């Protein structure tokens, strides 16, 4: 996307979102990141929405194929699951590469740095979902390390109701439950996050209250499923 203006890439990413063309949206946002400038809050959201939709479709397909393969146990189901898996890994590697070149290193404000480190944790988590064996171990540790650094910053620099802090805690709790085989840690983190947010709601405007309580309900939904 080297020949397209940064502003045009951003505009087209917004159009692609409206048109539900998430692969295009991700390509436009990759082009925008590669212009080398930092991303604004809204631009970070466009980047994240684009890739979350792309990798979300790949994950759903991988789970369908992996289930068929497990029930079967010719080479075709395994071959096709492997094809989808390689594609998924390629998208995760692309996102991680953007974060490493050079979004995280230039992100100094807590809102940007936490956002990108949460993304890093999430895309290593998606890699861990399809990994096996010792490869799984290092990938799991990479996700954990990213989430932990984000958590440390968020607790020092953001109020307990901040939506990014809440979503980070939600996703790290899912990591503990689904990836790290630590359901007690998952439940403890979700509980403590919910309770500390509750106690801070009194400080919020109507609009912020709506955002924070929406995410707190997701924490509660997981707690209900886990307990």
């Amino acid at each position: 996307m080297g020949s397209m203006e940064r502003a045009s890439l951003i505009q087209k990413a917004k159009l692609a979102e409206q048109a539900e063309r998430y692969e295009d949206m991700a390509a436009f946002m990759k082009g925008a990141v590669e212009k080398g400038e930092e991303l604004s809050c809204e631009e970070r959201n466009l980047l994240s929405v684009a890739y979350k939709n792309v990798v979300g479709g790949q994950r759903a397909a991988w789970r369908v194929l992996s289930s068929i393969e497990q029930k079967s146990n010719g080479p075709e189901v395994r071959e096709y699951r492997e094809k989808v898996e390689t594609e998924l890994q390629g998208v995760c590697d692309t996102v991680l590469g953007l974060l490493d070149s050079h979004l995280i290193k230039e992100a100094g404000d807590a809102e940007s740095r936490v956002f990108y480190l949460k993304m890093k944790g999430d895309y290593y988590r998606y890699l861990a979902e399809v990994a096996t064996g010792d490869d799984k171990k290092r990938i799991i540790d990479s996700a954990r390390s990213a989430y932990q650094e984000a958590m440390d910053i968020s607790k020092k620099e953001m109020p307990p109701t901040n939506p990014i802090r809440l979503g980070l805690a939600l996703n790290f709790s899912v990591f503990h439950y689904e990836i790290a085989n630590s359901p007690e840690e998952a439940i403890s983190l979700a509980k403590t996050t919910f309770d500390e947010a509750m106690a801070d709601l009194h400080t919020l405007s109507e609009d912020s209250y709506k955002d924070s309580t929406l995410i707190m309900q997701l924490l509660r939904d997981n707690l209900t499923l886990w307990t």
Partner: peptide
């Protein structure tokens, strides 16, 4: 369980 949906923004 459920991570943040994050597919609309």
């Amino acid at each position: 369980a459920g991570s943040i949906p994050g597919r609309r923004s």
